Design a protein around this nucleic acid. Structure first.
Ligand SMILES: [Mg+2]
Lengths: 55, 104, 75, 145, 57, 143, 189, 144, 68
RNA sequence: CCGAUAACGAACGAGACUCUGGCAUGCUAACUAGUUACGCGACCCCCGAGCGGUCGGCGUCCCCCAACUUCUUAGAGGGACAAGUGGCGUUCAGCCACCCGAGAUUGAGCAAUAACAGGUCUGUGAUGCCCUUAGAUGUCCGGGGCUGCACGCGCGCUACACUGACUGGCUCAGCGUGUGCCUACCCUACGCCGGCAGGCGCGGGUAACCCGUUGAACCCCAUUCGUGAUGGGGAUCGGGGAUUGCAAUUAUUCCCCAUGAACGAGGAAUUCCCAGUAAGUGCGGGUCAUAAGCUUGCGUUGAUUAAGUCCCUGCCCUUUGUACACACCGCC
């Protein structure tokens, strides 16, 4: 409808408040260190970010 | 002026962090500054465990991602003025440097 | 072997049995006297501490779960 | 002294509508009364001023009726209001602690009220199902087959 | 202080920034012989190097 | 041959000081001591009626070990395992007001003072009394 | 000499059989004040042999779920029980234990894979190390089973288990399961 | 009569349990964390604390004061570090203040009875893996 | 068990022995140090494993005709 | 890997490699870690010590106004290689025991060619094809649902107790984490109120600076219980009170008073495992406005049997037969 009810329902928390910054998905989010990255996109940029595998 | 300056360095590779430590304190040693030793702060290990598969089928295998953060503190406390003598930074990529007066 | 239903408190026929033959054998615990005189076991702890104040029975261990006593030297 | 069993001994008593064993501790004997729990028992013996280690079978009859009447009027014997059962009553609002068959029929009164108003818990209780909203998928099968 | 962020969040944010930068550089400069990005960032100002085989385009 | 409370068994000492407080009943023993549980993780109230003298004796001995503790620091020390029923066991602290009213009554005895910072520590008067019972419980240990 | 638990000097005890003379470890070389040691005895074969047998009984006394790591409760009940047997017999508790070990060690057994007559097929005699290992377990289990639904405790249950094994009265579960084994081994020769 | 600066500080660690002894020339006295050697939580295991001192005789301890401190570990692993620290501190005093022949007559008794009094236990832990609930334990795999 | 030496460790060890026979003896720790300046071995673990094979080969070449 | 050798020279994998734990009183450092010494106090002493003892009570980078790295932290390095002795072995390749040694097998990560019609188009502004596209299979809003139960299956937690439960006292960890671009929501010291769940102010920490000396659980020492479906057990259910959120009914969660169910060691079958293992046992992280019975990690306590075999189940090399080649779940 009009601007008053097109986005009426609040989204201050929950999965609806936070989405992935890369693939724009609300599942598998890694909020540790405020990554806000998709569970698979995190591995995609793992080398670029600097997370190495040691053990 | 009379000043005391605390310098802290933080990077991801210890080799270039020990190099940026070495050359800065070495120049002060020639410039007659009283340099406290490099304070090796405990290394912050940023570990994240993430499921390898994107779909959830398999033998339930994970992935352990380590990220090492090393901090070293160097104190440049000579009784005389220090700020004008040290103007260069001569820093390298991968490190973050910091200047702070001992007041705060 | 359906229930033990031991007397919670003594009567005349077991009060004298405790005080005439129990301080006669070396191996005495609240457990052993329970299977001999058919007593409860909480009462046995009360009776044993009575006999320690009466002074006819020596102490050996005194632990919170395994408290043991003994007879004095004979002869 | 581990003395002999008291002569005036009730092997099993009879308090209100139930019986308590006289061969055990008095505090854990009155817990056999429906509505009377352990925490209730170990606060009414302190407020009635009695020995604790005494067995249930050596309570004198005036001590017996004292503990009963202490629990019979818990509102006026320094017992805190957050310790009763039917506190903030639906029926009359007053704060009560019932320890008899009246507890059983006040559970009946609450249950029949839910049936009357046909709430969700009333209907769930009618069918015999769980009412606390837990999963019914794989449990509760012992009472079925 | 509260003005800044912790070292844990700061380095992660920089890694996020590098990953965002490289992906955009690859996407915008796909046909331009682009290879990779190395950033030599100083607190005074940020400075970025784009590695490519052909610079006239 | 001096005697310090740290030089003997603490368990024998803490019972000695609780009875010492029992005879000198000037301590503020509140009106609900016969009612409450000492902790959230405890299902049964303690058997001893003078558990208040027990807790006061316990915390004073602790304050000599280290000062600056607050109400939260006490309830952390006095915390214990919670069975939690069907769920796996957790850890829970004690009762906050129980520690708070014990601590308040201690200044009623004038043996502990609030610090310049948060928490409280011993007065030399309280330090005198803690070691005062330490001497006699050490003498009773030898003889 | 070592005064285990403050008393019961280890220099007086003996092993009556030479198959076990070098496979029991209460000697003066293995004389320890306390039966508790994180000595890493079991990291190698033929190395638990030099582990003190009192230590081995202590380790083997904790079983069945709730008691697998709890060792302080075990050492204390071992201490309570050893005074109990010393009281009930008048002599060295290690001598009570050593007689229990020898008399409860199953001298032979039987083990096969194929179709069997009753339980096993062929009789194979055990090693002296197996003799000590099985005797320790059988004594521990007899105490463990005797203290499950009775008012008696672990120390006294272990006491009668060791005593009935040491003398021999077919009341010890350590010898009763031993003879039940010897019957099957002899019959399946 | 007032000889200054005759002291050593010797540690011992096992299963992360750290004990640091402050050995000094003084009266025969043993204290850990300001507490008597006898007054300690594991009275059942106190004979392990008495095990070093008994095996050497208080003659060697009369002219030595020991001040141990513990900053971690468990309960019984704490003791096994403590007893090692005490004996190693004593033989370190005897190493650099008297002849090491005195160290030999006291080292051989330590090494013959238990090498843990001189060489600490090196086994620490093993990390848990994502296959199951433990370092080696795996979950209950099921086929139907 | 499981300490047999791979091709890499054996091949370099044979070569350096027959090139610097005059500069090599039978002490292991001396042997592990000579190989540092006559061969650039990136691994400290690899260099003293070679020297372990060097001591064995020197112990046999002093008595019999090794293939080196 | 040694050896012969129609082979010769090689490639990858294994090995090697990184990280992790193990000794380093060797070096370098350390007021965002401390230890000793000294000087103040406070107490117990005193018959009297007086360098008696304790203090995580105060101090000596509150820059002239102590020394040092033993404890802590992390860099540079060393150190282990079957180095030495005996034996076995072609006396080679290599194997076994042992002295000395911190360690004589610490665990992970990586992981060859080739393949599966194995899983993912519900991760992606990765995508082909097909479908829909305005009464939308797009998007928004409200409500319901994913919870629903005669039943079977699988992963798990809690018990059946006395090697225990309850009550009080004593007394210890290491991981690791904390205030937001979007995006609102941190971790909490202390003081007061409430019995508890909680509430109200005074701060601190963007962190070896505060939580936090992370006073965890287990256990240690004493009390009650006393072999009963019991003070085991807490299932089911009633009443009441609090926080989070617009929203708590189908009960988010927690607390308090109540009922106290089955269950008294579990059939056929079957999982995991060789030393800091299993197991007991709590604590971090993730999921999170609200949160763990899960999961990923950490810590406390710490055993038994075994140093072997191809018997049941499979695997690798060689030989062999095949009517198999979708390859024995074959063929016929
Ligand atoms: Mg009751």
């Amino acid at each position: 409808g009009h601007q008053q009810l097109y986005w009426s329902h609040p989204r201050k928390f929950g999965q609806g408040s936070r989405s992935c910054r890369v693939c724009s998905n609300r599942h598998g989010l890694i909020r540790k260190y405020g990554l806000n990255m998709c569970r698979q996109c995190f591995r995609q940029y793992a080398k670029d970010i600097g997370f190495i595998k040691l053990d | 002026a009379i000043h005391r300056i605390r310098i802290t360095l933080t990077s991801r590779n210890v080799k270039s962090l020990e190099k940026v430590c070495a050359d800065l304190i070495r120049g002060a040693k020639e410039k007659n500054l009283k340099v406290k030793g490099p304070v090796r702060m405990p290394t912050k290990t940023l570990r994240i465990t993430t499921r390898k598969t994107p779909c959830g089928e398999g033998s339930k295998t994970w992935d352990r991602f380590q990220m090492r953060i090393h901090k070293r503190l160097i104190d440049l406390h000579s009784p005389s003025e220090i700020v004008k003598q040290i103007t260069s930074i001569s820093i390298e990529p991968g490190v973050e440097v910091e200047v702070t007066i001992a007041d705060a | 072997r359906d229930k033990l239903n031991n007397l919670v408190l003594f009567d005349k026929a077991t009060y004298d049995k405790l005080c005439k033959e129990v301080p006669n054998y070396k191996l005495i615990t609240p457990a052993v006297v329970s299977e001999r005189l058919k007593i409860r076991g909480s009462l046995a702890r009360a009776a044993l501490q009575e006999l320690l104040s009466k002074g006819l029975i020596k102490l050996v261990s005194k632990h919170r779960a395994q408290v043991i006593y003994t007879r004095n030297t004979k002869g | 002294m581990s003395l002999v069993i008291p002569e005036k001994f009730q092997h099993i008593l009879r308090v209100l509508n139930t019986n308590i064993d006289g061969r055990r501790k008095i505090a854990f004997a009155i817990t056999a009364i429906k509505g009377v729990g352990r925490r209730y028992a170990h606060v009414v013996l302190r407020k009635a001023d009695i020995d604790l280690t005494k067995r249930a079978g050596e309570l004198t009859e005036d001590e017996v009726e004292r503990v009963i009447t202490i629990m019979q009027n818990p509102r006026q014997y320094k017992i805190p209001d957050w310790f009763l059962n039917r506190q903030k009553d639906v029926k009359d609002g007053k704060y009560s602690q019932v320890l008899a068959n009246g507890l059983d029929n006040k559970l009946r009164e609450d249950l029949e009220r839910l049936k009357k108003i046909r709430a969700h818990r009333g209907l769930r209780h009618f069918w015999g199902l769980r009412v606390r909203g837990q999963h019914t998928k794989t449990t509760g099968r012992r009472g079925r087959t | 202080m509260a003005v800044q962020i912790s070292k844990k969040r700061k380095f992660v944010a920089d890694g996020i920034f590098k990953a965002e930068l490289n992906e955009f550089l690859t996407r915008e400069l796909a046909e331009d012989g682009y290879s990779g990005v190395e950033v030599r960032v100083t607190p005074t100002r940020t400075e970025i190097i784009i590695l490519a085989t052909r610079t006239q385009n | 041959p001096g005697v310090t409370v740290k030089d003997v068994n603490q368990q024998e000492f803490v019972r000695a000081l609780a009875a010492f407080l029992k005879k000198s009943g000037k301590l503020k023993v509140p009106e609900w001591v016969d009612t409450v549980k000492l902790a959230k993780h405890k299902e049964l109230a303690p058997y001893d009626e003078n558990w208040f003298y027990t807790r006061a004796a316990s915390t004073a001995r602790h304050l000599y070990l280290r000062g600056g503790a607050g109400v939260g620091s006490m309830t952390k020390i006095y915390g214990g395992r919670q069975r939690n029923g069907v769920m796996p066991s957790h850890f829970s602290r004690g009762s906050k007001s129980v520690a708070r009213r014990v601590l308040q009554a201690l200044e009623g005895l004038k043996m502990v003072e609030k610090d310049q910072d948060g928490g409280r520590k011993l007065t030399p008067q309280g330090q005198r009394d803690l070691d005062r019972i330490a001497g006699q419980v050490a003498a009773a240990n030898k003889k | 000499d070592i005064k285990l638990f403050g008393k019961w000097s280890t220099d007086d005890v003996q092993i009556n059989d030479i198959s076990l003379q070098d496979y029991i470890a209460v000697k003066e070389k293995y004389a320890k004040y306390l039966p508790h040691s994180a000595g890493r005895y079991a990291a190698k074969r033929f190395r638990k042999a030099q582990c003190p047998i009192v230590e081995r009984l202590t380790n083997s006394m904790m079983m069945h779920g709730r008691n697998n790591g709890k060792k302080l409760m075990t050492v204390r009940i071992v201490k309570h029980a050893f005074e109990i047997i010393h009281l009930l017999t008048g002599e060295n508790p290690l001598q009570v234990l050593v007689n229990a070990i020898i008399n409860s060690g199953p001298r032979e057994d039987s083990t096969r894979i194929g179709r069997a007559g009753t339980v096993r097929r062929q009789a194979v005699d055990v090693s002296p190390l197996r003799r000590v290992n099985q005797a320790i377990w059988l004594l521990c289990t007899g105490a463990r089973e005797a203290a499950f639904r009775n008012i008696k405790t672990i120390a006294e249950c272990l006491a009668d288990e060791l005593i009935n094994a040491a003398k021999g009265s077919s009341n010890s579960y350590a010898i009763k399961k031993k003879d039940e084994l010897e019957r099957v081994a002899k019959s399946n020769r | 009569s007032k000889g200054p600066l005759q002291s050593v500080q010797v540690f011992g660690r096992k299963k992360t349990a750290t004990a640091v002894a402050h050995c000094k020339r003084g009266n025969g006295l043993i204290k850990v964390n300001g507490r008597p050697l006898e007054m300690i939580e594991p009275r059942t295991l106190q004979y392990k604390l008495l095990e070093p001192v008994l095996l050497l005789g208080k003659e060697r301890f009369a002219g030595v004061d020991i001040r141990v401190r513990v900053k971690g570990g468990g309960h019984v692993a704490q003791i096994y570090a403590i007893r090692q620290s005490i004996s190693k501190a004593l033989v370190a005093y005897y190493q650099k203040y008297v002849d090491e022949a005195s160290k030999k007559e006291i080292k051989d008794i330590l090494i013959q009875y238990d090498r843990t009094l001189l060489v600490a236990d090196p086994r620490r832990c093993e990390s848990k893996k994502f296959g199951g609930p433990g370092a080696r334990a795996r979950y209950q795999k099921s086929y139907r | 068990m499981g300490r047999v030496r791979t091709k890499t460790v054996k091949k370099a060890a044979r070569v350096i022995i027959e090139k610097y026979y005059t500069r090599l003896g039978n002490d292991f720790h001396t042997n592990k140090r000579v190989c540092e300046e006559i061969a650039i071995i990136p691994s400290k673990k690899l260099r003293n494993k070679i020297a372990g094979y060097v001591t064995h080969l020197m112990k046999r070449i002093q008595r019999g005709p090794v293939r080196g």
